[PDB]
């Protein structure tokens, strides 16, 4: 549930993944603010979002919702005094922001999957705009939360990693190692500083932070971009405090637990109702009877279709 909550997705040039995350979060009846790191990507995102595929919000039952549309802003993490200005601007526009899904800078950090062949030409961009960039954004957000204390639940900052195409993801590994600690050390400091009267007197009472990671570079399938959406939307819109920092997808989705959820919550609600019963259906090949047989088999009973 995210009705009264605002989710700002700290996206980058990843139009497809960020827009998919925006759709899966707006399916939880929540307004979104999609900020893109690099320029020349805002207009492509606007064109893609103009289409009704991503311009309409439907919840997990398949019912459309009149939730607020997807806003679009420009953010420059590596460049201070402008990201903070945009943060205060979106403050004035909407109010405080607490849910911040932080995605990396670029899709593929390097064109070649190697670390020693290079001679400081692209790894400088990596180490300067995707590690430091993340650190700058983390403080940009921390200041917004502490400079402006807001009494509510703990602050949530997911740290979704990039997907895998080929040759694994050596850079994803690096960012993951830097993230786990940033989340760990932060969570601790935050929780310790939530009770100190010294920092409490600054304005009003503030709230702590609880962050995680959602590693995806191990699963190479077709539903890893829908499993990731499920895990990002479950750790934000619910009250579930993971005691572990890094989370990892299964090497095989259908292999361990194959579940397909095209917004089919009715069939999930109709689970184990009529279990261990045999049913005889007449003309259950096409029409109402076929659908009754479908929902009864999904319920758990035994069916015998005759036409």
């Amino acid at each position: 549930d995210a009705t009264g909550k605002v989710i700002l997705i700290c996206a980058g040039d990843q139009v497809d993944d960020a827009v998919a995350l925006a759709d899966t979060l707006r399916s939880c009846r929540a307004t979104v603010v999609i900020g893109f790191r690099d320029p020349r990507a805002l207009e492509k995102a606007s064109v893609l979002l103009r289409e009704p595929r991503h311009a309409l919000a439907a919840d997990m039952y398949g019912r459309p919702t009149m939730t607020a549309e997807a806003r679009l802003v420009r953010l420059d993490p590596l460049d201070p005094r402008a990201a903070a200005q945009t943060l205060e601007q979106i403050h004035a526009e909407l109010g405080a922001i607490h849910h911040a899904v932080v995605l990396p800078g670029q899709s593929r950090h390097a064109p070649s999957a190697s670390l020693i062949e290079v001679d400081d030409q692209v790894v400088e961009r990596f180490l300067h705009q995707e590690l430091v960039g993340t650190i700058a954004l983390a403080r940009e957000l921390a200041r917004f939360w502490e400079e402006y204390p807001s009494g509510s639940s703990m602050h949530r900052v997911l740290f979704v990693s990039n997907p895998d195409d080929q040759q694994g993801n050596q850079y994803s590994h690096i960012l993951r190692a830097a993230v786990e600690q940033l989340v760990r050390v932060w969570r601790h400091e935050s929780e310790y500083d939530s009770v100190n009267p010294a920092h409490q007197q600054e304005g009003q009472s503030s709230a702590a932070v609880w962050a995680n990671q959602l590693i995806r570079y191990v699963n190479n399938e077709m539903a890893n971009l829908d499993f990731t959406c499920a895990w990002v939307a479950k750790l934000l819109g619910s009250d579930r405090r993971i005691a572990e920092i890094n989370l990892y997808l299964p090497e095989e989705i259908v292999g361990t637990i194959g579940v397909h959820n095209p917004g089919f919550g009715w069939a999930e609600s109709l689970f184990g109702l009529h279990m261990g019963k045999v049913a005889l259906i007449t003309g259950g090949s096409a029409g109402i009877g076929g659908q009754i047989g479908r929902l009864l088999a999904l319920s758990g009973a035994h069916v015998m279709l005759a036409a």
């Binding site: 549930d1 619910s238 009250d239």
Partner: protein
């Protein structure tokens, strides 16, 4: 209405939802201490508080309930009936009207009117004796739905719920009540039988309230029926109760006297308290237990599955029903299936005055009321006097101007006292008492309403909410079109030989569509009232058959075609009235 119970149930529900993994901040729930539902003007504060803490209203559940004083129609006071109807029926439309203008802009609106299956069902008014108000006010809660579903529009949904007997009090209070009513019954039958043959209560009241059955039997200076009743009590009744030696009690004495007073049997300044107070054990517990078993078994014998549902099942069924987005104006049955002894509306059953039947009520007194349909009343008077040659006709009128208009309209049946008129000024009790005092005691009373339909619109979208039927009009409509019938029927219930015939207005010609819903409201509510009343009037020693007659949907069917052709309805009205007014 109470605070501690609400606090405890909120604690339990908030714990349950916290275990349900929702982003709870104790904001999903709220309380309103002292939110009594029988006062209408105080609901606006509740609505404002709701729209302030939350913002709007999307689901409205009209589940306020009042069992009622739990007596027979012929015993009820008017104030209890008004309280029951206000706390049970009007409180639905009050909130509905207060929330509709904002509800229209939402689009996901739903109104649920939780009713009782004993109230009735579509096209069958099932009986439910001794709980008349709880049947009328539960039939109204679905009549409103059936009449308003079409006009509410697509954005708002509206249905009802009718759960029957639901349980996982033992009817001890019910057992005591049925025993006491039995007492009022044989005592009332005794005096009636005594006064039926050359006797008067005047000389029968002084020794009556002595509650000494031995003295009554030994003295033998009193009419026989009470003596035989005393002997039957001496033989059959249990010996382990005060009843074995005493007759009345602190309750069945005042109530019975009031019955006689209301029925006109006993005049004023003839009321006194009990000289002797019977001891505490008036009724042997064994009798209470036996009546409890009997009631239980009679209730439980109607189930097809031979078991009763629990609140959880009906709550689950209602909650699952609330998610339907294609149903409007239908009554659901969350857990039912029972055997009933009900009645079904005939819809203009065919019938005419059969020869050799008439002239039975010749030289008698007939009763009618009304001021709205003047031509109808004068037509009745002409058809009652030309053929029947009625000895006395009484037509009470709400206002004196209409009385003068009626007197000028007839102007030919005077100089004999047959055509007698009288003002009412909205006080049916005063007019009926004057009729029982100076005029005779007519049997076939007719509950013709004094005033016409509200004649206003009730369908509109957001931004236009001025001409709509508001809660004041609705209360006036309920008071004049439902409560008026109850008042007339109940006050005329305690009459020997009464033939009460409820009549709902046949609307008019060239009618709009908006006012074709209040008609259905009146139809259903009066159907439930007359069904319950007729069921009660059968066991009750005196049998006053109530028969409801309406002329709506009779070849009209919302089809506008009325060029002349009035004689059809002119003859149909008299055919129906004379047919229902002459039994056997």
């Amino acid at each position: 209405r109470n605070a501690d119970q609400l606090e405890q149930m909120r604690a339990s529900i908030v714990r349950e939802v916290r275990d349900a993994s929702y982003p709870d901040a104790e904001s999903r729930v709220a309380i309103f201490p002292g939110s009594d539902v029988s006062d209408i003007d105080g609901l606006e504060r509740l609505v404002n508080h709701t729209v302030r803490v939350f913002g709007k209203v999307d689901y409205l559940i009209n589940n306020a309930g009042i069992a009622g004083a739990e007596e027979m129609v012929i015993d009820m006071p008017v104030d209890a009936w008004r309280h029951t109807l206000r706390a049970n029926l009007i409180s639905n439309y009050a909130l509905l009207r207060r929330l509709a203008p904002q509800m229209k802009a939402a689009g996901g609106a739903y109104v649920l009117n939780v009713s009782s299956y004993f109230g009735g069902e579509k096209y069958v008014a099932i009986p439910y004796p001794n709980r008349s108000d709880y049947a009328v006010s539960k039939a109204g809660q679905r009549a409103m739905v059936e009449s308003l579903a079409r006009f509410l529009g697509p954005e708002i949904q509206i249905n009802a719920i009718a759960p029957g007997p639901v349980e996982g009090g033992l009817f001890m209070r019910r057992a005591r009540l049925i025993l006491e009513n039995k007492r009022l019954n044989e005592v009332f039958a005794a005096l009636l039988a005594a006064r039926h043959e050359g006797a008067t209560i005047a000389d029968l009241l002084p020794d009556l309230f002595a509650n000494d059955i031995q003295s009554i039997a030994n003295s033998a200076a009193m009419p026989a029926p009470l003596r035989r009743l005393a002997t039957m009590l001496r033989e059959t009744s249990d010996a382990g109760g005060s009843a074995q030696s005493y007759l009345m009690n602190a309750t069945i004495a005042r109530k019975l006297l009031n019955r006689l007073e209301n029925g006109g049997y006993i005049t004023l300044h003839d009321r006194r308290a009990l000289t002797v107070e019977p001891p505490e054990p008036f009724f042997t517990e064994a009798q209470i237990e036996r009546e409890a078993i009997k009631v239980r078994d009679g209730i439980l014998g109607m189930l097809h599955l031979q078991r009763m549902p629990t609140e959880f099942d009906v709550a689950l069924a209602t909650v699952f029903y609330l998610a339907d987005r294609n149903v409007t104006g239908e009554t659901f049955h969350p857990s039912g299936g029972l055997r009933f002894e009900r009645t079904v509306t005939e819809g203009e059953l065919f019938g005419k005055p059969g020869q050799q039947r008439l002239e039975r009520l010749k030289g008698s007194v007939v009763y009618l009321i009304g001021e709205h349909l003047r031509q109808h009343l004068v037509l009745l008077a002409r058809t009652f006097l030309d053929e029947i040659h009625v000895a006395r006709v009484v037509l009470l009128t709400e206002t004196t101007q209409a009385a003068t208009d009626l007197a000028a309209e007839l102007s030919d049946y005077e100089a004999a006292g047959r055509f007698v008129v009288i003002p009412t000024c909205g006080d049916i009790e005063g007019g009926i008492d004057r009729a029982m005092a100076e005029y005779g005691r007519p049997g076939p009373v007719i509950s013709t309403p004094f005033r016409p339909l509200p004649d206003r619109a009730l369908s509109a979208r957001n931004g236009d909410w001025s001409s709509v039927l508001t809660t004041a009009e609705f209360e006036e409509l309920v008071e004049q079109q439902i409560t008026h019938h109850f008042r007339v029927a109940r006050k005329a219930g305690l009459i020997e030989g009464a033939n009460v015939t409820l009549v709902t207005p046949p609307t008019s010609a060239r009618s709009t569509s908006e006012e074709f819903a209040l008609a259905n409201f009146v139809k259903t509510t009066l159907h439930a009232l007359t069904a319950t009343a007729g069921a009660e009037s059968e066991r009750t020693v005196p049998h006053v058959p109530v028969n409801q007659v309406d002329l709506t949907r009779r070849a009209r069917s919302e089809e506008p075609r009325t060029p002349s052709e009035e004689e059809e309805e002119l003859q149909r009205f008299v055919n129906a009235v004379l047919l229902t007014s002459a039994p056997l």
